[PDB]
Motif scaffolding. Sequence first.
Motif, PDB file in Angstrom:
ATOM      1  N   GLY A  93       0.780  -1.239   0.000  1.00  0.00           N
ATOM      2  CA  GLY A  93       0.000   0.000   0.000  1.00  0.00           C
ATOM      3  C   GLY A  93       0.825   1.311   0.000  1.00  0.00           C
ATOM      4  N   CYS A  94       2.091   1.266  -0.502  1.00  0.00           N
ATOM      5  CA  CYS A  94       3.060   2.355  -0.543  1.00  0.00           C
ATOM      6  C   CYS A  94       3.240   2.864  -1.973  1.00  0.00           C
ATOM      7  CB  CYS A  94       4.411   1.886   0.047  1.00  0.00           C
ATOM      8  SG  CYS A  94       4.358   1.411   1.814  1.00  0.00           S
ATOM      9  N   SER A  95       2.380   2.413  -2.867  1.00  0.00           N
ATOM     10  CA  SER A  95       2.480   2.837  -4.243  1.00  0.00           C
ATOM     11  C   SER A  95       2.210   4.317  -4.353  1.00  0.00           C
ATOM     12  CB  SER A  95       1.502   2.095  -5.108  1.00  0.00           C
ATOM     13  OG  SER A  95       1.520   2.602  -6.406  1.00  0.00           O
ATOM     14  N   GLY A  96       3.029   4.998  -5.139  1.00  0.00           N
ATOM     15  CA  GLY A  96       2.862   6.422  -5.376  1.00  0.00           C
ATOM     16  C   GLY A  96       3.475   7.290  -4.282  1.00  0.00           C
ATOM     17  N   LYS A  97       4.107   6.674  -3.286  1.00  0.00           N
ATOM     18  CA  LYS A  97       4.671   7.449  -2.201  1.00  0.00           C
ATOM     19  C   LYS A  97       6.156   7.226  -2.046  1.00  0.00           C
ATOM     20  CE  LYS A  97       1.557   5.783   0.826  1.00  0.00           C
ATOM     21  NZ  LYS A  97       0.442   5.192   0.007  1.00  0.00           N
ATOM     22  N   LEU A  98       6.848   8.239  -1.543  1.00  0.00           N
ATOM     23  CA  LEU A  98       8.259   8.106  -1.222  1.00  0.00           C
ATOM     24  C   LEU A  98       8.410   7.771   0.254  1.00  0.00           C
ATOM     25  CD1 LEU A  98       9.533  11.177  -3.219  1.00  0.00           C
ATOM     26  CD2 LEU A  98       9.721   8.792  -3.918  1.00  0.00           C
ATOM     27  N   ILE A  99       7.480   8.279   1.064  1.00  0.00           N
ATOM     28  CA  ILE A  99       7.456   8.037   2.503  1.00  0.00           C
ATOM     29  C   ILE A  99       6.098   7.393   2.819  1.00  0.00           C
ATOM     30  CG2 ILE A  99       7.528   9.046   4.812  1.00  0.00           C
ATOM     31  CD1 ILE A  99       9.169  11.432   3.484  1.00  0.00           C
ATOM     32  N   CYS A 100       6.090   6.174   3.407  1.00  0.00           N
ATOM     33  CA  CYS A 100       4.885   5.385   3.703  1.00  0.00           C
ATOM     34  C   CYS A 100       4.797   4.845   5.152  1.00  0.00           C
ATOM     35  CB  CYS A 100       4.858   4.242   2.644  1.00  0.00           C
ATOM     36  SG  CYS A 100       3.563   3.043   2.725  1.00  0.00           S
ATOM     37  N   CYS A 101       3.904   5.433   5.961  1.00  0.00           N
ATOM     38  CA  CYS A 101       3.724   4.967   7.338  1.00  0.00           C
ATOM     39  C   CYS A 101       2.775   3.769   7.215  1.00  0.00           C
ATOM     40  CB  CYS A 101       3.126   6.067   8.283  1.00  0.00           C
ATOM     41  SG  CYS A 101       4.187   7.583   8.543  1.00  0.00           S
ATOM     42  N   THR A 102       3.021   2.698   7.970  1.00  0.00           N
ATOM     43  CA  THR A 102       2.172   1.506   7.866  1.00  0.00           C
ATOM     44  C   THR A 102       1.565   1.065   9.202  1.00  0.00           C
ATOM     45  OG1 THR A 102       3.897  -0.144   8.226  1.00  0.00           O
ATOM     46  CG2 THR A 102       3.690   0.827   5.990  1.00  0.00           C
ATOM     47  N   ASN A 103       0.877  -0.089   9.180  1.00  0.00           N
ATOM     48  CA  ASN A 103       0.237  -0.655  10.368  1.00  0.00           C
ATOM     49  C   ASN A 103       1.130  -1.652  11.108  1.00  0.00           C
ATOM     50  OD1 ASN A 103      -2.451   0.466  10.021  1.00  0.00           O
ATOM     51  ND2 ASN A 103      -2.826  -1.157   8.509  1.00  0.00           N
TER      52      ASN A 103
END
Lengths: 118, 117, 117, 117, 111, 427
Positions: C55-65
Amino acid sequence: QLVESGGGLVKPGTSLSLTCKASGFDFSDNYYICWVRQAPGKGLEWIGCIFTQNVRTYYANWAKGRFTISKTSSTTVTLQMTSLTVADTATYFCARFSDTGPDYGLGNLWGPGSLVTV
Amino acid sequence: FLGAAGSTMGAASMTLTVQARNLLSLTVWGIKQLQARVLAVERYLRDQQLLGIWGCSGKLICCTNVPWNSSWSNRNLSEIWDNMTWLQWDKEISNYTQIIYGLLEESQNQQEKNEQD
Amino acid sequence: FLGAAGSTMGAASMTLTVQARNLLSLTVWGIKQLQARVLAVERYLRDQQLLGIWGCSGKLICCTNVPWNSSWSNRNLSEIWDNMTWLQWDKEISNYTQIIYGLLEESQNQQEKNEQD
Amino acid sequence: FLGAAGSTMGAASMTLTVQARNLLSLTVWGIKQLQARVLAVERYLRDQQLLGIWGCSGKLICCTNVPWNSSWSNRNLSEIWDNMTWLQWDKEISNYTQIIYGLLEESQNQQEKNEQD
Amino acid sequence: IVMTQTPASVEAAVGGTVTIKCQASQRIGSHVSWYQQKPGQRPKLLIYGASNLESGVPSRFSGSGSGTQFTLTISDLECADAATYYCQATYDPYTGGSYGAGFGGGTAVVV
Amino acid sequence: LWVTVYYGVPVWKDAETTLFCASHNVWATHACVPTDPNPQEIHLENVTEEFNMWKNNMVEQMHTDIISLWDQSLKPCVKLTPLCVTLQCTNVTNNITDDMRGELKNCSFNMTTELRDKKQKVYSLFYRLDVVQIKEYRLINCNTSAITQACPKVSFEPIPIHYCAPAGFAILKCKDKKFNGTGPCPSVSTVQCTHGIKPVVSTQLLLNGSLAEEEVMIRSENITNNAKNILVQFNTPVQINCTRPNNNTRKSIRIGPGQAFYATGDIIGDIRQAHCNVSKATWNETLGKVVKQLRKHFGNNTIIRFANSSGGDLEVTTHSFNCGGEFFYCNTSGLFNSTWIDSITLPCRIKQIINMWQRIGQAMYAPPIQGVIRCVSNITGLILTRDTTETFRPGGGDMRDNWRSELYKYKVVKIEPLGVAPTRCKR
Ligand SMILES: *[C@@H]1O[C@H](CO)[C@@H](O[C@@H]2O[C@H](CO)[C@@H](O[C@@H]3O[C@H](CO)[C@@H](O)[C@H](O)[C@@H]3O)[C@H](O)[C@H]2NC(C)=O)[C@H](O)[C@H]1NC(C)=O
Ligand SMILES: *[C@@H]1O[C@H](CO)[C@@H](O[C@@H]2O[C@H](CO)[C@@H](O)[C@H](O)[C@H]2NC(C)=O)[C@H](O)[C@H]1NC(C)=O
Ligand SMILES: *[C@@H]1O[C@H](CO)[C@@H](O[C@@H]2O[C@H](CO)[C@@H](O)[C@H](O)[C@H]2NC(C)=O)[C@H](O)[C@H]1NC(C)=O
Ligand SMILES: *[C@@H]1O[C@H](CO)[C@@H](O[C@@H]2O[C@H](CO)[C@@H](O)[C@H](O)[C@H]2NC(C)=O)[C@H](O)[C@H]1NC(C)=O
Ligand SMILES: *[C@@H]1O[C@H](CO)[C@@H](O[C@@H]2O[C@H](CO)[C@@H](O)[C@H](O)[C@H]2NC(C)=O)[C@H](O)[C@H]1NC(C)=O
Ligand SMILES: *[C@@H]1O[C@H](CO)[C@@H](O[C@@H]2O[C@H](CO)[C@@H](O)[C@H](O)[C@H]2NC(C)=O)[C@H](O)[C@H]1NC(C)=O
Ligand SMILES: *[C@@H]1O[C@H](CO)[C@@H](O[C@@H]2O[C@H](CO)[C@@H](O)[C@H](O)[C@H]2NC(C)=O)[C@H](O)[C@H]1NC(C)=O
Ligand SMILES: *[C@@H]1O[C@H](CO)[C@@H](O)[C@H](O)[C@H]1NC(C)=O
Ligand SMILES: *[C@@H]1O[C@H](CO)[C@@H](O)[C@H](O)[C@H]1NC(C)=O
Ligand SMILES: *[C@@H]1O[C@H](CO)[C@@H](O)[C@H](O)[C@H]1NC(C)=O
Ligand SMILES: *[C@@H]1O[C@H](CO)[C@@H](O)[C@H](O)[C@H]1NC(C)=O
Ligand SMILES: *[C@@H]1O[C@H](CO)[C@@H](O)[C@H](O)[C@H]1NC(C)=O
Ligand SMILES: *[C@@H]1O[C@H](CO)[C@@H](O)[C@H](O)[C@H]1NC(C)=O
Ligand SMILES: *[C@@H]1O[C@H](CO)[C@@H](O)[C@H](O)[C@H]1NC(C)=O
Ligand SMILES: *[C@@H]1O[C@H](CO)[C@@H](O)[C@H](O)[C@H]1NC(C)=O
Ligand SMILES: *[C@@H]1O[C@H](CO)[C@@H](O)[C@H](O)[C@H]1NC(C)=O
């Protein structure tokens, strides 16, 4: 010089072949011969055209399946109606469109036309 | 499958699903097919990478954080969307492409990420 | 175009638009170019697939669960973001890569989808 | 790595992270490997393009704006999700695939974009 | 499959000027001819293309146009030079042929 | 206003890419992508685009690929090196007409057998055009290039192919009657694949091509510059009937292990000269049309004279015709013999040693064909050059000027789907 014939009064539901000839001319030149209709009280309407050195034809969309065009003798052409209705009563003309520059637009030779009544 | 057929930018902006799909769609005529398939893939991915970095991935129409600089054009939106062919427009502002693209990248990396984390 | 030039993770996290672009950018020296182009594409797509599934597509920085498991590190964020070079960090936790990636996939498939439908 | 192992659509919809990854995963046995790598990439990208145009990019499960047309099936959701193998389902409605896909594209281009701009 | 004409009817005094206008639904360059049809007669050609008169056509007839916008100006109108004027597309942008391909009109010019 | 990014915009720019082939024969290859049985053509309303047939790189690709195929297909065949031996050879006189005196010779020689320690005495009838007098003869090109015979199972029929753009690219077609070699045209459509083009190889008269639809087209670069070729496209075909009347036989002679030479055999019936028949009235009307169109660039009362040919080799002065796999070099004189202010019989010669696209360093031997050949073709256009009176005559040159006559309608472009415009919205 173009002279139409084959007109007259016909009954609804029949077929009809109109022809014209070029008096004084062979059609083996760069010419388009086009058929144009004019119902009384109406303007001029395009039916279709035949290129005479290479017989190829073009039709008005409304005329498709109703009219066909062909060449016969080197000096004559024909327009054939596949069926006729009362709405097709009109003056029919053949005319020659000669070659100017990029455009066979020299629609300067028109016959007197003939009448078809249905 | 192409537009710009008298289609001004307004109307042209609505046909994007068609033009967007025809981008992907050892004998003399053997090796050439392999090379051609690789080329088609390469072009597809380069455009997708730009949409990704600008935050336009998955969209046909993408509004961004970059303001329009008037130095880029001499017309109102009311003039170009209604009177110009997409193709004409692209030619008229072609020399600013690299400016706009650099601005679009900054508008994401900083404005939507470094400043959001 | 590379960073990690004394750039600690904090500063390094801001240069991601550059390093992210240079990933895509029958003679002896003929066939080799075809093979090399295919390799460059393959690597690009493998990374994009992982960003997609997490779920990090399109992002450079991705906070997750996925919570950080302390068994993965011996430092505070206040120590690593300011004192460690991105490159040093990646080496220090390299043996946990496969753990984190598996957790990230579950954190989407179940938590953001099977539980949202 | 494949499912449909007695797995009805309900259960099968939860294993999508596995099947979604095994899609990408001049000698006689030299040139053939190059050709095979290109094929694997091509298939991967074609599916991703469809998810993109339908607005399903980045998701394993995607609810859309296209209503189900009853002409496409003769069963209730309570019958198919619990009694049918994903594989059986796909065969039963295979002749409507092209209808649904065209509707899905319109459901984005117009409904989520031309009407949102 | 291209032309439309809009003035319908125009009246003028002897020695006056009238204009008529046609439009194309598709761009056709300069490929528009013009005709003059007197009542009871086969039509006469006045204009070959948007800017070219046929020899024998009085200099009082003139016109211009391009793309989709075409006009005819008739100056120094002579008494009883009444006619219906028409436009013809001489270029078919779909088939590529260059021949009369669509015709229409009606002007009722009366003097 | 703000920048809005649009993807899938209908924008294209000029481009050069390789093209795909879509469709045993030497060119057909039988490794092309099957064509679309229901191909699309998309008309572009209000689009005017510029084409230039003289700078069209599709011509260069056709040329490069056909040459590469020629060799890929004929390379794995029997070499005829052992035939570069002194031949003892005399004239064929047993049953010939006057027109054939000295045309054929009966040659015999000492050649290698299946075993390398043994020789055989064999004979073959050769055409005069294939030998050099040193009664001792050498084959043409044994002092210049290696000679390889073509494989007897390979067809030389000009089976058409289609060129197709890769995804991301498209081919624009200029659907415009009376469009000359260059400039803008208002009628354009988009296709993915071209019409099928037959890889016909000829000189002077173009055979089995497309026809013009409204008038004979005269296309040339400059026109006034007489160093350029004029490509004349007829709007009607002229039918030409070519024949090789002698009933031939052939022999298979082993030249060593695994290989055999196809020698000519004996001739059945009397020996007559090969020839082509051009319908006369049709030809006269066709040139009259060419002349009326030529005058548009030279003057309405300018005399247009047609001459037979310039001096030169057979590849220049005679018509080059390849049919049945046989190679003909026809007189082509009497067709161009007028000033403009039944059938025409053209005597024709046959040659078996061929030097074609690669003018030097390589030669191919055309094996004999048994029986009698009759071939009917469509003359679709002329290659003319120019010298009160203008003089024109049949020309020739590299094949690129013949193949471009089928590709003048196409241009390759690339699609650039990503771009921007100002809008009243923002993120
Ligand atoms: C221009 O087009 C015509 C029509 O396609 C070409 O004529 C064709 O030529 C081939 C090869 O010579 C003929 O095929 C042969 O037929 C005999 C049987 O008669 C068979 O035994 C052979 O094995 C071979 O298949 C073909 O019949 C003939 N077509 C017609 C209608 O006559 C012509 O060659 C083309 N011109 C040039 C210069 O390529
Ligand atoms: C290389 O390391 C040195 C420290 O060992 C970094 O120098 C300091 O950088 C900070 C900014 O992050 C400044 O406030 C200090 O004043 C600098 N120290 C000195 C002595 O000048 C240096 O920036 C690192 N190189 C890079 C590119 O980050
Ligand atoms: C293969 O089919 C059988 C039924 O025909 C499935 O067995 C049942 O599974 C459910 C769980 O979904 C259990 O509650 C039942 O008790 C099982 N039945 C029996 C007789 O044990 C079986 O699960 C299917 N295989 C797979 C992998 O799903
Ligand atoms: C080609 O250009 C012409 C105008 O020069 C366009 O014709 C007009 O289109 C609008 C709709 O956008 C209609 O309301 C007008 O009535 C049309 N004018 C005429 C004279 O009929 C034409 O639509 C353009 N072609 C395409 C495909 O957009
Ligand atoms: C020579 O030209 C004629 C006329 O164009 C060709 O015959 C036509 O072939 C098309 C199919 O390609 C048919 O649809 C037409 O009905 C045919 N017309 C006539 C009058 O027969 C002929 O095939 C051409 N010959 C060669 C060798 O190309
Ligand atoms: C070329 O050959 C064709 C036949 O393949 C000749 O045309 C035929 O002529 C006979 C009369 O001798 C007619 O009965 C046939 O109907 C014609 N066939 C066709 C298809 O037209 C043609 O005349 C020959 N041309 C030349 C120059 O000799
Ligand atoms: C072009 O025609 C002329 C005139 O016929 C040729 O010149 C001579 O023609 C006679 C036959 O009438 C031959 O016997 C002579 O041998 C020809 N002269 C020469 C020098 O060869 C001329 O050769 C023809 N040119 C070509 C290329 O065929
Ligand atoms: C060629 O010579 C051979 C003898 O070597 C003879 O049998 C044959 O008939 C001759 N052929 C011709 C055409 O003269
Ligand atoms: C062979 O041809 C040459 C050239 O025409 C001639 O001089 C010679 O006499 C001929 N030989 C025979 C046997 O006819
Ligand atoms: C074959 O070789 C012998 C060697 O004595 C020679 O006399 C003869 O003329 C040669 N024959 C041919 C046809 O070359
Ligand atoms: C082969 O011999 C001919 C004899 O006429 C000569 O003209 C030609 O130049 C020679 N070939 C080579 C490569 O020298
Ligand atoms: C082709 O037509 C253009 C005008 O559309 C003209 O400028 C050009 O000179 C013509 N080409 C030749 C060879 O005459
Ligand atoms: C050419 O015409 C002649 C008659 O003048 C005839 O005998 C011959 O067979 C014809 N050749 C061809 C190929 O039609
Ligand atoms: C063509 O035939 C004529 C006889 O009419 C002859 O004089 C001329 O040399 C021949 N031309 C060629 C190129 O063979
Ligand atoms: C050219 O015409 C003349 C008659 O004016 C004729 O004698 C001559 O043989 C013709 N040339 C050819 C090659 O047929
Ligand atoms: C060919 O055209 C010339 C004029 O250039 C004429 O004198 C001759 O009679 C014509 N021949 C035929 C068969 O039409």
